[PDB]
């Protein structure tokens, strides 16, 4: 109310409204899902168009050969943050000949988002991210919130109506975590997960976006006729 | 009025309302504690399990500074990470110039001055965390608790978060019942009990326990996480006491 | 942050005026009147000191009339402290030009630069404008005798006769009435003193409440002399025209 | 972080007033009375030493300060603001004059530099004006003795005699009746003590009054001999005992 | 450094500081540009609440940017000096690197770019000035007239006016200027320009300035008597 | 009314942020006192440790600035420690630059100058603290100099600070009216400490255990704080008379 | 007031949303993409009849293979175009090749959110970027001050946009010839414009692989206007 | 005085056929009259069917290859995974080298 | 570069400047004009380091032209010469100093007098009846010391200049390919085409 003019102000109950308003931009975003087994990690994203004459806004971005993310909210902010991750992954490779641990990737995003919540003039990032990767400790899934909070999960979803997929994955937990050495089945589970968040619209060929990374699979994105297999 | 709209402004009382508002963010956070013992310190924290989908043991909240200091905090988690990052920078520059690892009182003032600095200007926000931290140096064990204002003291026991009062009461009993001192292994068990007892004030979601310790005899003066057999033993001791 | 306490000194009103410039001009309208009159054989500068006390040291005093170089002087209306900042800049600028070209600075060039500094404080930097209006009196070998005025906006104009500060409206009407082009310095001296005497907010115009200066070619052959009048000389010139 | 206040805190109001300068002058009005009188062979500056507690040692707090060997300063208004102005004034007499010309600045020019510093606190970003009026007394070879008043705006005026602060209105009127252009330094000291008694309420002695003169050169206060051209400071602070001697023949 | 964003969007999509800068232009003395078949004429109003002026030394309303291009304006006088100075410096810089004087379009594009920059830079307000820029490109005889405004937009005009009561004189020019047949001579162009100002001015005495620019750096300012002859002639044809 | 939020003048020529910083001074509800002997300067302050979980040895408002200078603070501990670190750094630099130990009064002036800046510059708040500096200066002898959020400073024969400062001040005034001298006419610092505690007891009307007090003593070439047992030894001596 | 980079309670940036209102006040610009080329058309909208309309420049070349149309505060577009041209030429210097249309568009959009307390405010202009490259063929992009860009088969921006876009939804198919697209832009511009459309108050342009980006003469557009009026009368 | 350059010896050779190209190099690495390694490869696959060798001062050789390999990576990131053609690689490598015109990479480069 | 000469007579200043541009063992050009017009009645010739000469000349030209447009007025030859001196005096303590020697010939319209200034790269200015830069002076100064009179006509000045060029063409080691001669008087600057 009187305490939402900027990020540098606490409300009387200890809230940061600018950060909460940034969180709200994610809620308006198109649904995206993340889930993993012990061998692979999979992103599934519902893409959104302006109208029938426009393209469908790309939701998934590659960060390295072993890492990448999906976005929900302000897309330019995802471009800034993904670019930062690309550099951090890159620095680790050039200087230490070391693939950046997905966990460190999370810590780095947390700290970058945090600085924008304590200084005057700045604003919080207005995007949520789901980071998947395969590193020296196996497959991983992370959830990034622009409050700075990063969380490691077996599965999750962010965006409008993400609660449907998040409930489904919570039920399916014991099944999909043991889909080891089978990419097409882990994707099927993710495609069924994102279906619990659809209303009046169904998954089409220029609507669905799937990404996968794992033990013997570089981070690769599927669009167009390559996702027809899964509808 | 309007005295509460800007950091670093004195109210007619002589108070900085923005700091007091940051304290509200801390009171909203989960419970974390510190127990000082014979030759070290023990840290424990409540991790609310929001969903089945959280990977157990894999969202670590206790943080190490240098190789001998442990830090835990309640409130805005990102703010706590910022403070630890600074703590690590301070500790590195102390070790660079003076060779010896940073003493705990020295480290306490480094964090204190840095947090106090975020109450001096209207262009920054106060920290939304109270931080319990400590370790072992050349003069033995030290436990500290630092608040958003920059205020810190040495503690026999310390608690912050939603279950702070419950935990404080439990801490005071230990201080009264053990005037000679508590052992490191005993303090680990007690930490588990107190977190379980302090969980009553946050009992909707069930939780995951996380413990760490520094002890001159048990961990050789270095910070280590309590895992496996020692953790399950501490969990069981706590489970027996609530029933 | 600090946005809360920003007055925004360099913005437009809905009517397209600059608030701070307008308010600075309002401040200047309460300062003691200063008059400049340009004759064919010289220039007169006359200014009224702000309500004097009997224990003020009158001879070792300077408030209204300042020397920029040997050929240019200014009359001040507004905050004196603001004026000295600008006067020192102007003095340095004159010397820079002399050092560069080995010729004394043409009056307009000096007036333009000082006016440009004022302009800047109204467009960028978030600072309050200088609360000062100048009357420039000077000579150069291109235009001869020249009078200019500049104000807080950084706008400057040239004049045959002009007033700044208090009661300019009444002073200008009186100057417009009795001024003519073939006028001599000694006639201009009289007009200046007569105008101040009629527009003054005091009971009677006396020597101790005035600063006076002339810029004549009344030296010896083709060169210009600046005469900042001493107290006794103002007392005499006030008697010579029969004001006291 | 960093000073985000890069804008003026003193601005013109619709009526033309500069609010913060006016309010600074109001602070000066509340301040304890100080005065200055110019004689033919010297200048006296005086003020009351308002003690904050009887446990305080008022000798450790100097209201009259030496700026150069021939220039002294006193004030009315805010003490802390005055103290830093004295530091800055002493330095600028060196940096912008002595280090260039190998001699101390004449009174009018040092006064001019202090006025500049006070003017800038009226226009620069993120600062309030100084809450003090200064009275600066001094001597220099080509101007003789002089006395100046510097106000929060940065304006300065030369005075034969004047007062500033609490009871300045009455003190100025008192000085007008007593001042003539033939006053000898001792006559000016006498009038200074008389004028101050009107504005002082409690104890009136050499421990509650601070008074300094600008007069003859003091070779005994130089600290060395052997250079004929160096003859000693003209600034001298009268001792507590020297004040009481003059308070008997009052 | 002072950083404040002074020019910002309002809920309806307007930038008020730019729009208020246009009001300052509307307050300024009227300026008019008319281009003929072989010339451009710049006419300027001078307000007469100022008697006792010295016209020898007072800043003229039309300024030479180079020997072949001129600039007149409406709005804040102090603001215009900054634009004129920058334009004059760019004029010399262009001659130095390209070895050719500026085109009128290029000089205008530069002046407009400066104005635009002051609408999305921190710590500055927009220029309270609109300009008429007229002249002839090097080795070209086709007349050029351009107009700029505080926002930064610029365009070419057969004839245009800015300043107070400019809407009245624009009305006059809109029915009195034939695109198919522009004023064939200097005399015709000066007259149509003087006529348009007389709709708004008052006395045709020391209130109107006229500057004529012809090809190949041929710029001259008319004197009082020369202009007064146009005023006298127009009034006698009017009584009909 | 934004003139009450930053350090600009109010219409009556006041600085409210400075005034409110003075009120922050009493936020700890602790009273301090300083007196001078022939050879020493003693400063005492109340020690209130309400929480049983606190380590009482870490609760302190007296600081050793240099080997010769001590400082007690009245005000919140974050601002108190901010002032102490700056004072330590300033005193260390002075010694390096000028080749001799920083005098108590010069450090006081310097800290007072810094405080003055916060009353004039907008981006910096005043510190809500009053700083009392003590030493046995090699030129001036036993010295007490005190700083506040206004940037004011002065030397004292003796002084007191805190919520109940006026009671202690008049108590000390009345003693020096009687004794007719500027100090405590005593040989040992032990008895000057005893005088200090005695006159604090009378003025406040409370009894003290060894853990209710905090004592700093400045002698020639060193300032030191007393342990609980040093104070207990001192409390016993007062009781047995 | 309030920070320039402030979020609304609905999770949107005030200044970005307000600049979108400025663009709705701008003159109409339409683009249609075919397999034979991309057509860009704009309404000139002269504020007065004395203004020489051919000096109104709202269609602009970025490189031989990339063109651009604008709507809103058009003065804001100058530095965007300057950046676009430098980005395009610089990429050719560094890589001895043409820069992809999407890469160009992404580069321009990187400027967009570089405002705050960097420039003082967002741009008040939207851009239609049309071009060809060997990888993805003929492309049309809508670049907004939000930093977001969408690929379009057809798109209208400005005051007549929502009406013109609804018309483009009905008319566009994947087999349109270049000539068919030219006429369609003219037809839809004539519908949403205030004054009557002719060769002086509207401008056409296209980009083809073979001939690159070309702004049409007033003579060439006039004949397409005549061809359009005749075809509408012919049924 | 410190000499920032050295000479690691070895030699390289590139030949192009109608539908193929070879890039060969010996595996010996030396300083002065000593052998550092009998097998230290200096011909590298940089992705997008480009092979590269920078022969001379091995520290500069490795630094350049490292920077170009990284350049290929970012070319994909910035231009929708587009393949970097050999002519575009060549132009890019010119700028890598000329950027250190006044402190050169001490190598002969062949791709 | 190499040969630049100047003669001030009764009513004009005459500047003669060599036409050759030689680099190594090749004369690259034999029609080079080593001069810039700074204002209608002010001309500057220059000799010195390659690149530096034209860069400095054109920089000065731009500044004087800028001044002219700003003030609608022509600076006096004295004023222009003082500006040029100061620029060179600045330059001599820069990281890389301009190695350019100049002569400035002007007609002061306010005084109705010709004026010739010699300024070297250090910023050493002198007003002279006749001037030269480089090795040229070693032949021409003594020659002019003998034959020059202060009241000579422009024609007499040109004959006096022919005598200098002839001496240089006889005794100088290098072929400087003749001179371009320009006259500065009350009517401005004009070039003699047949020399
Ligand atoms: Cl200081």
From Swiss-Prot, chain E:
GO terms for biological process: proteasomal ubiquitin-independent protein catabolic process; proteasome-mediated ubiquitin-dependent protein catabolic process. Signal peptide: none annotated. GO terms for cellular component: mitochondrion; nuclear outer membrane-endoplasmic reticulum membrane network; nucleus; proteasome complex; proteasome core complex, alpha-subunit complex; proteasome storage granule. InterPro entries: Ntn_hydrolases_N, Proteasome_alpha, Proteasome_alpha-type, Proteasome_asu_N, Proteasome_bsu_CS, Proteasome_sua/b. Keywords: Cytoplasm, Nucleus, Phosphoprotein, Proteasome. Coiled coil: none annotated. The modification Phosphothreonine is found at residue 58. It is found in: Cytoplasm; Nucleus. Present with 16800 molecules/cell in log phase SD medium. The 26S proteasome consists of a 20S proteasome core and two 19S regulatory subunits. The 20S proteasome core is composed of 28 subunits that are arranged in four stacked rings, resulting in a barrel-shaped structure. The two end rings are each formed by seven alpha subunits, and the two central rings are each formed by seven beta subunits. The catalytic chamber with the active sites is on the inside of the barrel. Interacts with CIC1. NCBIfam families: PRK03996.1. PANTHER family: PROTEASOME SUBUNIT ALPHA/BETA. Belongs to the peptidase T1A family. This is Proteasome subunit alpha type-4. The gene is PRE6.
From Swiss-Prot, chain F:
The modification Phosphoserine is found at residue 227. There is a cross-link at residue 222 (Glycyl lysine isopeptide (Lys-Gly) (interchain with G-Cter in ubiquitin)). It is found in: Cytoplasm; Nucleus. Keywords: Acetylation, Cytoplasm, Isopeptide bond, Nucleus, Phosphoprotein, Proteasome, Ubl conjugation. GO terms for biological process: proteasomal ubiquitin-independent protein catabolic process; proteasome-mediated ubiquitin-dependent protein catabolic process. It holds the Pfam family Proteasome_A_N. InterPro entries: Ntn_hydrolases_N, Proteasome_alpha, Proteasome_alpha-type, Proteasome_asu_N, Proteasome_sua/b, Proteasome_subunit_alpha6. The keyword Phosphoprotein applies. GO terms for cellular component: mitochondrion; nucleus; proteasome complex; proteasome core complex, alpha-subunit complex. Its main location: cytoplasm. PROSITE patterns: PROTEASOME_ALPHA_1, PROTEASOME_ALPHA_2. The proteasome degrades poly-ubiquitinated proteins in the cytoplasm and in the nucleus. It is essential for the regulated turnover of proteins and for the removal of misfolded proteins. The proteasome is a multicatalytic proteinase complex that is characterized by its ability to cleave peptides with Arg, Phe, Tyr, Leu, and Glu adjacent to the leaving group at neutral or slightly basic pH. It has an ATP-dependent proteolytic activity. Belongs to the peptidase T1A family. Present with 15200 molecules/cell in log phase SD medium. This is Proteasome subunit alpha type-1. It comes from Saccharomyces cerevisiae (strain ATCC 204508 / S288c). The lineage of its organism: Eukaryota, Fungi, Dikarya, Ascomycota, Saccharomycotina.
UniProtKB/Swiss-Prot annotation, chain G:
The modification Phosphoserine is found at residue 48. Its main location: cytoplasm. The modification Phosphothreonine is found at residue 47. One of its GO terms (biological process) is proteasome-mediated ubiquitin-dependent protein catabolic process. The keyword Kinase does not apply. Keywords: Cytoplasm, Nucleus, Phosphoprotein, Proteasome. SUPFAM superfamilies: N-terminal nucleophile aminohydrolases (Ntn hydrolases). PROSITE patterns: PROTEASOME_ALPHA_1, PROTEASOME_ALPHA_2. It comes from the Eukaryota. It holds the Pfam family Proteasome_A_N. GO terms for cellular component: nucleus; proteasome complex; proteasome core complex, alpha-subunit complex; proteasome storage granule. SMART domains: Proteasome_A_N. The 26S proteasome consists of a 20S proteasome core and two 19S regulatory subunits. The 20S proteasome core is composed of 28 subunits that are arranged in four stacked rings, resulting in a barrel-shaped structure. The two end rings are each formed by seven alpha subunits, and the two central rings are each formed by seven beta subunits. The catalytic chamber with the active sites is on the inside of the barrel. Present with 17100 molecules/cell in log phase SD medium. Belongs to the peptidase T1A family. This is Proteasome subunit alpha type-5. It comes from Saccharomyces cerevisiae (strain ATCC 204508 / S288c).
Curated annotation (Swiss-Prot), chain H:
It is found in: Cytoplasm; Nucleus. The 26S proteasome consists of a 20S proteasome core and two 19S regulatory subunits. The 20S proteasome core is composed of 28 subunits that are arranged in four stacked rings, resulting in a barrel-shaped structure. The two end rings are each formed by seven alpha subunits, and the two central rings are each formed by seven beta subunits. The catalytic chamber with the active sites is on the inside of the barrel. Non-catalytic component of the proteasome which degrades poly-ubiquitinated proteins in the cytoplasm and in the nucleus. It is essential for the regulated turnover of proteins and for the removal of misfolded proteins. The proteasome is a multicatalytic proteinase complex that is characterized by its ability to cleave peptides with Arg, Phe, Tyr, Leu, and Glu adjacent to the leaving group at neutral or slightly basic pH. It has an ATP-dependent proteolytic activity. Belongs to the peptidase T1B family. This is Proteasome subunit beta type-6. It comes from Saccharomyces cerevisiae (strain ATCC 204508 / S288c). The gene is PRE7.
